[PDB]
């Protein structure tokens, strides 16, 4: 479990191979049916609205009413014009800045957690250095004791 990130400043390819060798050892309704069939077959369902070409007496009369609706649909747009567009453009700037404020709030608390970890790493890494240096000293002391004890035995 334990692996010190701050302290370990220093084999990855070697250890990866040894870990690799131990690994060598060890909901929708009808909608989903037609959607998966359309993607598998690679064919989009054809919409016939002969509206564009124009039986053609009807197709002709279709083009007129939609063209009149079109020319009325372009009148109410031009009346306002660019005022209705730039009013929505302002809303999009209020929406954008809110996201980047959260980017900062996350940025600060992310660096703040790492900041607390850093001190812990440096606290213990010293204590481990004390142990190991101390451990080395203890080993040396035991060797010296053994040499001295032997001398006493020799008398």
């Amino acid at each position: 479990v334990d692996a010190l990130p701050y302290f370990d400043q220093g084999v990855r390819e070697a250890a990866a191979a040894l870990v690799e060798e131990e690994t060598r050892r060890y909901t929708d309704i009808m909608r989903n049916e037609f959607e998966r069939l359309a993607a598998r077959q690679p064919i989009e369902l054809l919409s016939m609205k002969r509206y564009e070409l124009p039986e053609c007496v009807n197709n002709s009369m279709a083009q007129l009413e939609h063209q009149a609706v079109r020319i009325e649909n372009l009148e109410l747009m031009s009346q306002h014009g660019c005022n209705a567009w730039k009013v929505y453009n302002e809303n999009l700037v209020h929406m954008i800045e809110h996201a980047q404020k959260e980017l900062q709030k996350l940025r600060k608390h992310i660096q703040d957690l790492n900041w607390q970890r850093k001190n812990m790493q440096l606290t213990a890494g010293s204590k481990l250095r004390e142990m190991e240096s101390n451990w080395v000293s203890l080993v040396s002391k035991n060797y010296e004791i053994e040499r001295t004890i032997v001398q006493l035995e020799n008398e």
Binding site: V1, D2, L4, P5, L113, R117, M120, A124, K127, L128, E130, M131, E132, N134, W135, L138, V139, K141, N142, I145, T148, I149, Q151, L152, E153, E155
Partner: protein
Amino acid sequence: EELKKHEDSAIPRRLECLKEDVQRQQEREKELQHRYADLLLEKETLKS
């Protein structure tokens, strides 16, 4: 977050093992200088 939970769990585990490793030798240095106190003592007896 979970990496902190994995670290802050095993930060004392990395600590408490090494404390024993210090203490195991620290226990020995007493018995080392116990015997080192002994082997100086009988040395004078052989010197006398």
